[PDB]
Structures are given as structure tokens and as C-alpha cells.
Enzyme design. Structure first.
Site, PDB file in Angstrom:
ATOM      1  N   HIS A  41       5.853   6.160  -4.745  1.00 53.40           N
ATOM      2  CA  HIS A  41       6.678   6.490  -3.573  1.00 53.40           C
ATOM      3  C   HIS A  41       6.263   5.752  -2.293  1.00 53.40           C
ATOM      4  O   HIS A  41       6.974   5.888  -1.290  1.00 53.40           O
ATOM      5  CB  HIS A  41       6.809   8.005  -3.329  1.00 53.40           C
ATOM      6  N   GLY A 143      -6.881  15.836   2.241  1.00 50.52           N
ATOM      7  CA  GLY A 143      -6.536  14.521   1.713  1.00 50.52           C
ATOM      8  C   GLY A 143      -5.057  14.247   1.658  1.00 50.52           C
ATOM      9  O   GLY A 143      -4.248  15.173   1.547  1.00 50.52           O
ATOM     10  N   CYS A 145      -1.737  11.456   0.181  1.00 53.73           N
ATOM     11  CA  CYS A 145      -1.238  10.822  -1.034  1.00 53.73           C
ATOM     12  C   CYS A 145      -2.121   9.692  -1.488  1.00 53.73           C
ATOM     13  O   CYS A 145      -2.556   8.878  -0.677  1.00 53.73           O
ATOM     14  CB  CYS A 145       0.213  10.360  -0.872  1.00 53.73           C
TER      15      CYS A 145
END
Lengths: 301, 304
Positions: A41, A143, A145
Site C-alpha cells: 500500500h 510503530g 506500517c
């Protein structure tokens, strides 16, 4: 004495983290040998986000559209391919810090460490379990991606998870390093929600075995239960059903303590139906479910 | 929002892993920290189990020469060229500067402050965890065997601040240690004598910081319409084994109070009610327990 949750030392993974940028989208990548792995993505625009045709959109990207940064050094992308939901960027330099590694797929209930990263920079490390609903508990501050999950066995890093999205319920969802999602999730901007979560029964039993090994025995009772009777009660409390595989996995802890698994199940059944009655187990008032039988066998046996 | 489902994290341990070594004096082996050309470790490495009841460290050390210390970094033996004792820490000068030495500082922390510990055995890193120094100056450490010499640290913009070195296990499973200048935290000694940790208490200022983080993230179920005086709050909090809150703690919470529009003493009244009612099923930021190992420094930074 003292049973504390620990993450694996993260050094071997820190040496692999890089920043990947495609247009306006920046996220983390994992640099192993001459390949950078990241969520596919990264290539999405706001226009593409709903129902993207990833393979078609990707074959129309030039290598130079991908900006890979390792510290202050820019890595040149010389190739790109997609493997399920993971994008693989071939780079002109092999990572000199590449550890011995493998890509593995884990099962819900299994534990691993996550090295939370932002813009390719490691921020922190935590230990977690894959929930039975295939999500991982954690926030936008745990965190972003492309951050990865791993276990370390001897000197070998087994990579098992890559973060793809933070869901609105304070959990994240992702894939293995071969791009296969854990759970019924998709890498599109669509209404997606985690299913009702359950307690990881085999891990609670492992934790009760850890309590016994540490001399905390107040909850041990003289009773046994059948696997079916235990599952009938456990499911009423949103606990995962226990399988013969789970009974087998607890085998070494049963042999070490002299408490049969269905004997410990009867202890857990009593704990569910009657509570802790103002008592603690391993210093905690709540039952822990993110320690596997192996984590217990590894830390104290 | 930003912190829904927040999990405590340890700092990435890589910079510290590059500093861990194995130190052996006779039959005793433990962990050492190799920074530049010095290896730091607990001075009790020069003790046998027998020496640990009443060790005379000066007498034991005078009898040692550089060749009595075996320092191993991986498969490489480091040559000891000097030794000195600084309080409870032994400092071994070696012939090689650690090429993996990060930018670092030695700092002394206060009870309630947090840090990560890289638990090691025989100079090999085993795991990393995040913890706070308890008000009774102990740390809730790992199951253990030979973790003496494992260190505690924080990392700020690639600089490692070392704040703790593990020395002893107390009869209650908790751990006691020193700063990197060898000064113990708490009334403990590096001696196998009857030593017991005082009753531990909850770090009130950290619980309040966590409640402010929950409010910033829209989790408000526990709030009430009351305020309290600082003394009335302390009278109730102490009945629940919570640390007394000081004006310094009230000041530290200042930016969170200004950001949420909830006065500290107003949050204190909400905590007083939580202690009275309990969290039986309900969660705060996705957690079933009141967190006391997340500091105001970190909440303010994570909630700008």
C-alpha cells in the site's frame, strides 16, 4: 523468582530497518540482502485507496519512483515485484548487517517481539501475542506500517509479521513476510473491524504452570475435568476452546510440575467461576494470556 | 486516538547488545559493560559464594592482578591492562576500545523513573524489558540465574544513558543494584546478608499521568465532578499503599492539566474514587490495570 514479560534483543532487526517513500507516502521497510520488503500500500494515492488494482498500478511504477533511505545513504532501486500484500524492492546494495534469518508464519496465540519504527527509525520493542481474532494489541504510538514482528532462535531471526494498518480499536493488523494477511483483513481503505476477541486458554494454562514452578500454588485443587466439560465452561467466559494439540504442547510443563493438564484445567475452571477472591498469581490480580508454553519452558524450567 | 491500546515498550537494545561482555574471576562469571577501553561490572565478581556473607572487597582486590580477570567479547579475549574499584563497581581497563561504543552518559535515576533492562547471561543478551525503579528502590526483574552485570538504560536521540547495573537478588525475587558509578539504589549492600525490600507502593504521579493520557485519548469513564485538597488525597492514597503526591509531582503534571482542562487535584479526586471502586472489568487505554510504569515525561512528549 520473578516472572516478567521480555522481548527478544532487537539489535539484529534494527540493522535491517529502512525508510521507503513512494510519492507522498512514507513507511518502514525491511532490508535483507539486496531486497527491501514493505507493505504494497506504499504505492497508494487517496484516489487508489478504495478498490486498488495493485499489480496493474505497480507495473506502471518506475524503480526511481521508490525512494529507499538507510540512515543518510540512499539505496538505488533496480527492480520491483509484488508477493501477495508485500512489495519487494530489489536494491543495488546487499545489507552488510543482514542476520541469519527465515520467514515463518505463526498461529493465533503465538508470541513474538515487534520493533516499532517510524520513518525507518526504530523507536521501541515490545512482546505480544497474535490475538485469536488475528489482531495485535497496540497503538499508533507502537510503530507504523512496515514495522516487523520476530522471534530469535539461537542466532537466527524468524520474521513472522509485518504491520499494514492500525484499526480504530487500539489494535493493528498485518501479514507474514510472504504478504499473506493474518485474519479477514484487506489492504484497502474500507470499513474493517476486528472480530470479538477471546482469551488464549493454552497461554493462561502455561502461565499457571509458570506460577507453580515459582512456588505460587494456592489455586491448585484436587479435581480434574474432561476436555469437553472444560470447553463448555471456558467458552461461556470468552476463552478459546482447548484442543488436544494444546494439551500436548503443555505436556513438558505437566511432567515438570506433576500436575496433569486436565488437573490444571480444573484449577482454571474454578478461577473463572469464582474469581481470585482477593488473591494474586505471580503478583498479578489478572490472568495473563500472552506467555506461550514455550516462553515458560524457555524463561523458567 | 494516538494512545488507544498503548503498550509499554523497551528501547531498541542494539546499542547496548554491542557492549555486553563476559567477565570471569576464578570460578565466578557474570556480565560486564564494555565502553571505550573500560569494562564495568559488579565488584562481587571477585567473590566466591562463601565470600558473599562478609566480603572485604579491598582485601580481595589487592590480591588480584590484571591477569586474574578473563574478559570475553564473543569469541575474542580482551587483555586486562588495569583495574580499580569505584564504590560497588569494578572497572577493568582493556587493551582494545570497543568499536561498537555508542554515544553514552552515566546518569543516576530516582524512584518512579523508567528504563529498559537488557537481561544477559554469561555476557549473552537474553531479553529486554521496560520497568520503573520502584519507590522501595528495587526492580521487578527476570526469573534469573546469572544476570548480575545486566544494565538498565534509556536512549535519547542515539545517546544511551546508563542508569542501573544489576547486583543482587533479594529473598522476594526482586532485584537491587547500583548506578554506573557503583552507588547502590536504596539501603542495600553487595553482601549476602538479611536484606529485605521495604513494602512497595504505587507510583501515584505515573498513575495520574496515565489517566491524563486516557483523557487526551477520549477515555473518560472514571472522571468525577469532585476536587480534593492535596493533603486529603494523600491521606486516602496512603491507605491504598500509593506514594504521597508532592507539589513537585503536581507541577510535573501541569502541562497535562493545561492540555485537558482538568486540574491535578480534580484528577486526584478521580483516582481516589477509582481506588474506592476498583476496575473489575472496565479498561483504561485498553488495559485492565492502572499503569504506574509510564512517566509524565513520556506522556507529555507522546501527547504534544
Amino acid at each position: 523468582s520473578g516472572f516478567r514479560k521480555m522481548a527478544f534483543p532487537s539489535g539484529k532487526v534494527e540493522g535491517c530497518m529502512v525508510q521507503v517513500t513512494c510519492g507522498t507516502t512514507t513507511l518502514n521497510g525491511l532490508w535483507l540482502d539486496d531486497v527491501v520488503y514493505c507493505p504494497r500500500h506504499v504505492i497508494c494515492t487517496s484516489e487508489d485507496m478504495l478498490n486498488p488494482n495493485y499489480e496493474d498500478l505497480l507495473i506502471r511504477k518506475s524503480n526511481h519512483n521508490f525512494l529507499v533511505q538507510a540512515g543518510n545513504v540512499q539505496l538505488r532501486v533496480i527492480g520491483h515485484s509484488m508477493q501477495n500484500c508485500v512489495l519487494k524492492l530489489k536494491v543495488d546494495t546487499a545489507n552488510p548487517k543482514t542476520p541469519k534469518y527465515k520467514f515463518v508464519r505463526i498461529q493465533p496465540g503465538q508470541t513474538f517481539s515487534v520493533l516499532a519504527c517510524y520513518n525507518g527509525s526504530p523507536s521501541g520493542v515490545y512482546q505480544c501475542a497474535m490475538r485469536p481474532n488475528f489482531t495485535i494489541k497496540g497503538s499508533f504510538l507502537n510503530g507504523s506500517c512496515g514495522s516487523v514482528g520476530f522471534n530469535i532462535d539461537y542466532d537466527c531471526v524468524s520474521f513472522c509479521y509485518m504491520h499494514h494498518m492500525e484499526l480504530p480499536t487500539g489494535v493493528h493488523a498485518g501479514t507474514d513476510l510472504e504478504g499473506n494477511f493474518y485474519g479477514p483483513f484487506v489492504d484497502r481503505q474500507t470499513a474493517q473491524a476486528a472480530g470479538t476477541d477471546t482469551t488464549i486458554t493454552v497461554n493462561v494454562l502455561a502461565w499457571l504452570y509458570a506460577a507453580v514452578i515459582n512456588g505460587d500454588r494456592w489455586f491448585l485443587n484436587r479435581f480434574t475435568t474432561t476436555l469437553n466439560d472444560f470447553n463448555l465452561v471456558a467458552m461461556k467466559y470468552n476463552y478459546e476452546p482447548l484442543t488436544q494439540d494444546h494439551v500436548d504442547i503443555l505436556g513438558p510443563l505437566s511432567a515438570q510440575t506433576g500436575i496433569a493438564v486436565l488437573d490444571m484445567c480444573a484449577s482454571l475452571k474454578e478461577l473463572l467461576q469464582n474469581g481470585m477472591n482477593g488473591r494474586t498469581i505471580l503478583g498479578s490480580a489478572l490472568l495473563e494470556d500472552e506467555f506461550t508454553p514455550f516462553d515458560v519452558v524457555r524463561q523458567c524450567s
